[PDB]
Amino acid sequence: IAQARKLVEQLKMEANIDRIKVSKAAADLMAYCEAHAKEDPLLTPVPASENPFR
Amino acid sequence: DQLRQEAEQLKNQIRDARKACADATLSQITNNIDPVGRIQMRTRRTLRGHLAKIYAMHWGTDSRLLVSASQDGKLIIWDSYTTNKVHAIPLRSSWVMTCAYAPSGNYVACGGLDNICSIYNLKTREGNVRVSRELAGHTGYLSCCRFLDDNQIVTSSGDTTCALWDIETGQQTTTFTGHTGDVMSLSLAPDTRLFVSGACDASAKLWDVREGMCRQTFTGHESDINAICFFPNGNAFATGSDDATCRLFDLRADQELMTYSHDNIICGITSVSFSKSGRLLLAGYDDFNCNVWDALKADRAGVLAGHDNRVSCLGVTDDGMAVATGSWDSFLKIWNGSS
Amino acid sequence: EGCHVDSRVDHLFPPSLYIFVIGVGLPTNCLALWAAYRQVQQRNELGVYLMNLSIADLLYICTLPLWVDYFLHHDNWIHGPGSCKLFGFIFYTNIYISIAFLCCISVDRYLAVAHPLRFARLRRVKTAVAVSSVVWATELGANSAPLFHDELFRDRYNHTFCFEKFPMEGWVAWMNLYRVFVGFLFPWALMLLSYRGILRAVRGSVSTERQEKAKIKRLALSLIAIVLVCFAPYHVLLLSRSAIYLGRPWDCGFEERVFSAYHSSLAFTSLNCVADPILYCLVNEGARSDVAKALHNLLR
Amino acid sequence: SAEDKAAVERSKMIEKQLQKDKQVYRATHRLLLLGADNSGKSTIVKQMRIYKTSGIFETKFQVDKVNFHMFDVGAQRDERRKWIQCFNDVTAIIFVVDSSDYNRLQEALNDFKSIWNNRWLRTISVILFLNKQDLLAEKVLAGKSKIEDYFPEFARYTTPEDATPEPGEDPRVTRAKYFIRDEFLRISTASGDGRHYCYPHFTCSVDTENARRIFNDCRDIIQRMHLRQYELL
Amino acid sequence: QVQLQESGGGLVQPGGSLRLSCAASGFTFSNYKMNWVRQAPGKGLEWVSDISQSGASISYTGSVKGRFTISRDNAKNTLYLQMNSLKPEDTAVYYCARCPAPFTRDCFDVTSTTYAYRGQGTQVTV
Ligand SMILES: CC(C)CCC[C@@H](C)[C@H]1CC[C@H]2[C@@H]3CC=C4C[C@@H](O)CC[C@]4(C)[C@H]3CC[C@]12C
Ligand SMILES: CC(C)CCC[C@@H](C)[C@H]1CC[C@H]2[C@@H]3CC=C4C[C@@H](O)CC[C@]4(C)[C@H]3CC[C@]12C
Ligand SMILES: CC(=O)OC[C@@H](O)COP(=O)(O)OCC[N+](C)(C)C
Ligand SMILES: CC(=O)OC[C@@H](O)COP(=O)(O)OCC[N+](C)(C)C
């Protein structure tokens, strides 16, 4: 029944992991999104003059 | 039976910690951000020539050449800017389901129902594309493969295990285990130190290419996970499943961040890919349409609806200048915005 | 100077029939054209033929107005010989083009159903394009006798004929006989032989229900029978006139007796242009669905 | 701009090769072979050949100058709900079932139910091959095992007049064979409206007519989709 | 997250009755077709019965067609299997399986080994 031991050990390694609050992760994601939005042609359609797929 | 009780109680402890790690939802914090609005993408180009359903495609670092695998036995590298076919490789097995483009562009990988990963060299001295390697050892069909470099390749198989192979030796340097289901799709992080994988078990796992161990598992889904993709920052990822629901998971948060689903959507998700900025989350659905949602507000922002069959593969160029969608109609379609 | 042909219905029946034919066919022949184009887009070979057919029909419609005038003014052409040689040429010949394309459709259906696995070479889109080009060329060539001869004539009586002279010439008599035997009967026999083979193949199928087989039989028999109804009266009158002329060309009385039935038979042949878009389209669920989708798309 | 012309020429050559490979590809029919360990599908492959962790094996044969490619899934886990979707465009599915094993004639029926009700297999006609008829006949004649123990409704079942038993065939073995055939046909007709059809056949592992039967089934299937495509149905 | 825990069972003499329950968490019980499967000592995972989402469609095996009955409670998100007139050969571990995907009539791998969406199972002895 080594499966039980392996699962228990893996979940024990998973448990002892530092975690940060959901608010911090959401703030980081929002900061990254607003820090890269102007460089995204899909989010901000660039003019057709420089679009290779014109 | 003590081990089962230990597992149950430690899982309860993990759940308690995770809820303790939950102060506010992503909707609450992002309620004040301006909505994207409506994203109207136009079909700038249409690639034709494939004999059967496309199953997989991948962009290159050049953002100009794209490789697509079709279950008729053809791996076609197209030049997106000019629509001209650059390469057409006849595969030894027709049932190909995944393909990859090396970052250097000198090699291309593929695989399928045959438990072999075929690597072909695009820079042969003779100018004729030849298979460089046939990695073998998996006990199940190959579902996904990605290149760390020209000599290291990460692949997933239906045997519930992933494998990091060194191409030159033709041997699996590392084996990843822990999934109880068929491994569907894997995504590499931007820094190529960690990669995530979804394996049909209502969960996704994070793995280290160097240590060969599982760090975290996320189990927010209700059915098989079909596609997984990393956030551009590499700190989060998104997973689509047969439950017609997409879910965003942050590695540090160690739990679900946002759920993208709608009542009228009752079909599974086949592909998922983030944009360059990560604000727009693109997903392919079995209802013959592709939906792009707001990664923050979680509201549907745009729909393509241009394919006559289920969308099988979705990709975004490294520069985010176009989106390549391949469905079972034997046609890839390149979509781009307008102004 | 000619036979004193006269009719009490030539100014009422042919005009109204042609008006109805235009009104009902032009929208239905554009719809069938769109459906055939859609079929070609799906790489279906049949659509190619279904396109050409429709195009031919459309051409016919485009020439009917002038003839509606010809008959509304008691058989009097008023726009010159070239207008005759063009419009009346189309009107007398593209019906045989349509018949040839119906025969091509029947032969293609026979090859597909009866021989699904044997004739992949013939069942291709570009092969159909080549066949359609050959059909158009051959029909325009085998029907070009009139462009080499005069085709406007003025009578002792009021009428100024166009594309006919009841005191016929030998060339037109032989042309009519060829039209009857080569233009109509041969393609019709080939079509009825292709549909018999199709039904024979269908009967053997185990995956087809008896209701579906009955529907297929009904459709095939309707195609054959409606084509016969449309093209038999006019062609039988043509054959009788040619036969009586070839032996007794001086018999003007036969011509005076038949005039009215001849030019109402000729009008009746026009119903094929309306039947074709209704029988090869708008009766199949897929074609009707495509038609409805196109109508909704263009309406919105 | 010379390199652009060279690229266009290369694309033209690739397109010509692709077209040659499309004539060739539509000239051959693909088949999916499914079964269990009890079913003698491997023997069927080794008998129709007369015309490693490989994962999938390919068998190419020819009947009436028509080429057929059969694919047998060799090395995969018992889970099959995913890779089966790869065969959503095969010409036919040859399902081999051991009729001489009642304990697992219900697992095979459940597998057939799943195949018939699958979303991606709604348009594929399934060729049902009731294999190992001799074993079933001997088992029934011996009387040691009774079908009623596993399928009680067999007691009420009666042989239909549509049956065409072989000469010298016992009433009991014909009754059992047609009971199994009707059991499969009930699930076959439970779902599907003229999109995919089931072809039950009484076949044995050692038979030279299996290829001919498959060829006839493919002929019928292609005929039906030609009827649908050409607007005749 | 997806859990399917079975409750009930035990040592019951032949001819008795037993009601086994299936408690489901981590998913929407109302949108998934459910199955009851069995594994006897030394035998494979034999299928027993299946019930659709709304319960309007029900199927059993020949061995339990006239003996067992199945039911579902979407309000409580649970399954119920009532066995009556038990037989000695019914002793086995009974598992409660969910179909792979929602809004489908296809249940392909509910009998496969190491199935992810199957419960631990309850022992029934008779
Ligand atoms: C100079 C003008 C008056 C000539 C008119 C010819 C018309 C009536 C006919 C003759 C041959 C016909 C073409 C023959 C075959 C095809 C198949 C495909 O390619 C589209 C239409 C097309 C190309 C046809 C279009 C109409 C066509 C061109
Ligand atoms: C001016 C128009 C109305 C004349 C055309 C009349 C058409 C509709 C008539 C004439 C002959 C008729 C057909 C005569 C015989 C049969 C066989 C029968 O089993 C199905 C109906 C079918 C196929 C009839 C359908 C309708 C039919 C084709
Ligand atoms: C379906 C296919 O494979 O194509 C066959 C088709 O080409 C036959 O056409 P024909 O019957 O020969 O037309 C001749 C008419 N005529 C003589 C000028 C009046
Ligand atoms: C244009 C050409 O060369 O092809 C002609 C071919 O179409 C004729 O063969 P069919 O009459 O169609 O078949 C026989 C029909 N049947 C079975 C006797 C009723």
Author numbering:
A (entry chain G): 9 to 62
B (entry chain B): 10 to 348
C (entry chain R): 7 to 306
D (entry chain A): 6 to 56, 180 to 361
E (entry chain N): 1 to 126
What does the report in the manuscript say about this coordinate set?
Our structures reveal an intricate proton-sensing mechanism driven by a sophisticated histidine network in the receptor’s extracellular domain.
To elucidate the molecular mechanisms of proton sensing and activation in GPR4, we determined high-resolution cryo-EM structures of GPR4 in complex with Gs under both physiological (pH 7.4) and acidic (pH 6.5) conditions at resolutions of 2.59 Å and 2.36 Å, respectively. At pH 6.5, the protonated H10NT rotates toward Y163ECL2 to form a π–π interaction, while at pH 7.4, it interacts with E2627.29 and a water molecule that restrains its movement. Structure-based pKa calculations identify H2697.36 as the primary protonated histidine at pH 6.5, which is supported by molecular dynamics (MD) simulations analyzing specific residue side-chain minimal distance distributions. Additionally, Y762.63, D81ECL1, and E170ECL2 generate a polar network that coordinates with the protonated H2697.36. GPR4 exhibited enhanced agonist activity at pH 6.5 vs pH 7.4. S2005.57 forms hydrogen bonds with both the phosphate group of LPC and S1123.47.
